[PDB]
């Protein structure tokens, strides 16, 4: 298939587009990170309604002590909750 070819195109075009809306051309900040997820991954990744999730994940996801998140850190932890949460589905209801 040609699905994966498009997959990489979607991830990076949106990553650098909003990541440089007010911060740096290609570095994320706590404020760029939460807006990027509430934008298209709604109901999948949460940050606005769960405040504990933002400070605990973002501050510790910058495990290097960078109040800014790199693209590599964002894809690993955010993609974990992406496939993990989907598996539970409503079946966990």
């Amino acid at each position: 298939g040609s699905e994966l070819e498009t997959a990489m195109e979607t991830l990076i075009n949106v990553f650098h587009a909003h990541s440089g809306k007010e911060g740096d051309k290609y570095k994320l900040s706590k404020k760029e990170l939460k807006d990027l997820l509430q934008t298209e991954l709604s109901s999948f990744l949460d940050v606005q309604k769960d405040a504990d999730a933002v400070d605990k994940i973002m501050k510790e996801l910058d495990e290097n002590g960078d109040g800014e998140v790199d693209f590599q850190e964002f894809v690993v932890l955010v993609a974990a909750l992406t496939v993990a949460c989907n598996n539970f589905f409503w079946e966990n209801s």
Partner: peptide, 12 residues
């Protein structure tokens, strides 16, 4: 990482 992972999924 795994230890705190339980908190997010448990607390969610």
């Amino acid at each position: 990482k795994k230890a705190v992972w339980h908190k997010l999924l448990s607390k969610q």
